[PDB]
Amino acid sequence: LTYFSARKGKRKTVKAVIDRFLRLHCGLWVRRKAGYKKKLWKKTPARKKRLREFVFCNKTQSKLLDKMTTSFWKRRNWYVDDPYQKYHDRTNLKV
């Protein structure tokens, strides 16, 4: 990671992460499953369907992806017709 840039003295975003993961404002990260476009001819429909899910990351990965991205990527956005709009806030979550 770049903790301090040579031009701005600022930490930089790892753009590999931006191209693979979605950050919801609540702090969850959403990924695709590895291998969901590979060798479909040998995978069962149950396996193919599992491979097509959008899934959540665990705490360790979330903490890691938070550290590899700057604050811009954690701001609340108000995109029009965002497919994920309802997934940005948590409901009925205890501890």
């Binding site: 969850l28 959403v30 899910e53 959008f54 899934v55 959540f56 990351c57 665990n58 705490k59 979330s62 994920y84 709009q85 309802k86 997934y87 806030d89 948590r90 409901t91 009925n92 979550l93 205890k94 501890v95």
Partner: protein, 354 residues
């Protein structure tokens, strides 16, 4: 470590010294029949029967019915054998049976069935429908008096009541035509109770009809202790049992203190408990006949609730338990994105402080 078995283990009585000599279940059906006999025996290990089978009371079910008829098996067996010989003697019957063109007269079968196995078939059927369980709290009786009940539908049709068939409340708008075989000078009591229709108490019944001190089979001449009120199965409350009970009386009985007014449109007065009713009058009364039908809501039940009973029509729904979900985690690792929909309350977008 080993624990010795608590009793005879399966297959221990099989002598395996002479294995090749022992006979085998050369057939599947042969094995199966022995297996089902084995499944029925009591066992000292845990069984499906222990966990799923109904826990019947150890004491035998008290019999409260009429005594069985006296029959001479010797004379019957002789006459019974004679009749078959005559059938088999005929050459035409042998040919139809051989050519698979013979048939039985169902009307005659039914006619004879009423007098031999009918009573005992009606008892097992009333036991499966749980009438002795509810009406008499487990006490049983064989309905040895064939009871025929029919609701008049239109002008040319009848609707029998039999044992468990379905009659609609419209068909049963008006009292049924009842007939049975009774000797002159005998006294009877006939009641119709809804076992399942009660709208307030789970353990109570509704008295739909009561005729007492009937002379013989002259039902019309019986005292109208409780007037006839058609079944009113509430909507969405399912299928109800409606049971006719024919009681044999030892003597004329006075039911003045249990009579309902005419007309009787108060559900609090029609509240009834057959076990309490019979227990009071068991000493001079004996169950003899049994018929019953099943009844679900139709449009005519609205008229009963609105007009006759002067009330609102109660409507029920079958409500299932809410679906189970594990406790929501802050990080639902590897769950699909719709995991969040399982814990959402509303589908419309929220906005918080904005």
């Amino acid at each position: 470590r080993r624990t010795p078995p608590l009793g005879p283990m399966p297959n221990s009585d099989i002598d395996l010294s002479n294995l090749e000599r022992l006979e085998k279940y050369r057939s599947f059906d042969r094995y199966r029949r022995r297996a089902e006999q084995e499944a029925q025996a009591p066992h000292w290990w845990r069984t499906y029967r222990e966990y799923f089978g109904e826990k019947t009371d150890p004491k035998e079910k008290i019999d409260i019915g009429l005594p069985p008829p006296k029959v001479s098996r010797t004379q019957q067996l002789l006459e019974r054998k004679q009749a078959i010989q005559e059938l088999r003697a005929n050459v035409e019957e042998e040919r139809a049976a051989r050519l698979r063109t013979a048939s039985v007269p169902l009307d005659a079968v039914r006619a004879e069935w009423e007098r031999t196995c009918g009573p005992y078939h009606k008892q097992r059927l009333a036991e499966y429908y749980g009438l002795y369980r509810d009406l008499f709290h487990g006490a049983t009786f064989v309905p040895r008096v064939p009871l025929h009940v029919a609701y008049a539908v239109g002008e040319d049709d009848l609707m029998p009541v039999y044992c468990g068939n379905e009659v609609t409340p419209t068909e049963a708008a008006q009292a049924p035509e009842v007939t049975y075989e009774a000797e002159e000078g005998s006294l009877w009591t006939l009641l119709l109770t809804s076992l399942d229709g009660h709208l307030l108490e789970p353990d109570a019944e509704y008295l739909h009809w009561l005729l007492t001190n009937i002379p013989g089979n002259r039902v019309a001449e019986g005292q109208v202790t409780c007037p006839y009120l058609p079944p009113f199965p509430a909507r969405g409350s399912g299928i109800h049992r409606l049971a006719f009970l024919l009681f044999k009386q030892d003597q004329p009985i006075d039911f003045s203190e249990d009579a309902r007014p005419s007309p009787c449109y108060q559900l609090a007065q029609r509240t009834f408990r057959t076990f309490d009713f019979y227990k009071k009058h068991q000493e001079t009364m004996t169950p003899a006949g049994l018929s019953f039908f099943q009844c679900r809501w139709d449009d005519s039940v609205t008229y009963i609730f609105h007009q006759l009973l002067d009330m609102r029509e109660p409507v029920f729904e079958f409500v299932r338990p809410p679906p189970y979900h594990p406790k929501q985690k802050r990080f639902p690792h590897r769950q699909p994105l719709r995991y969040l929909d399982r814990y959402r309350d509303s589908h419309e977008p929220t906005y918080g402080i904005y």
